[PDB]
Design a protein around this ligand. Sequence first.
Ligand SMILES: [Cl-]
Length: 238
Amino acid sequence: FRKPQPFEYEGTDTGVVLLHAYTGSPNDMNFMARALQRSGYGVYVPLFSGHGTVEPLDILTKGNPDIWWAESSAAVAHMTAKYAKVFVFGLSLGGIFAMKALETLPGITAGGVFSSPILPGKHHLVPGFLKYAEYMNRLAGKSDESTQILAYLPGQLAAIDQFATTVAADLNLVKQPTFIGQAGQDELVDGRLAYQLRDALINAARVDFHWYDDAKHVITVNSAHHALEEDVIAFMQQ
Ligand SMILES: [Cl-]
């Protein structure tokens, strides 16, 4: 098993922070990061605590939204030290921190989300996490950990939602141009909430909203990624 590491591409004038998904890793952003590099952007993809190991329990016992927020904030600061302009985007979980960054951190030009409605709703992250863990255990030749996982999973999902509702309540603080991309066949989160995210951004200079009709949740990796990359790059060029 290869532990995905954080990675960085050097640019000149503009840098981009890409924040990965829950149970995800910097691998979530490989295609996006390279697309940005081909267009001359600097890119930084951090690793969230507890992620990127062969042991799914690490996510539940070594990471939490407060740590991940600190890591997101540190990632933004790393890039704003170097580049004239910095953009911050996030996939699902990462999108929560991307929006909180726009709301509360200095020096960010613009940013937004990939399949991250922010407003909590009906989701399928419990089955999603369990399927992820089952796949990881099958890779590592390890026995099932579902009972151990279920002692933590409801609580951590609740913690993420709790963090998210605060971010949602502060959406009025966002003044930067904001990008919203949402999968149209999203099996993990309620895509309808992306419309509520859009409508809550009452003070954003602009809201660039894109719906990826036939795509499943992870639009940075699946069939939608070429379209998403083009739309994100067009947004940045504006
Ligand atoms: Cl997520």
